[PDB]
């Protein structure tokens, strides 16, 4: 029958206009204890490739 979106993915990565997959930078939910502002800061969003391609394929019905 029909297809189910993957909530796991839907909950952590956003898909943009150009069809690009964008998600937070992984490495700071707790690592830290002292990491030079630079590291702990430098955390906006980012991409992937051949990998985001794999994502979009799970967020179909949610386009």
């Amino acid at each position: 029958p029909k297809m189910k979106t993957h909530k796991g993915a839907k909950k952590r990565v956003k898909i943009t206009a150009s069809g690009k997959v964008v998600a937070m930078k992984t490495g700071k939910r707790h690592l830290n204890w002292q990491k030079s502002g630079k590291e702990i800061r430098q955390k906006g969003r980012k991409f992937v490739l051949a990998k985001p391609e794999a994502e979009r394929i799970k967020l179909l019905l949610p386009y």
Binding site: K11, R12, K14, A23, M24, T26, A54
Partner: peptide, 12 residues
Amino acid sequence: TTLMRLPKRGMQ
């Protein structure tokens, strides 16, 4: 998997 990336979308 590649499920090492975390959930931002804070408000599920």
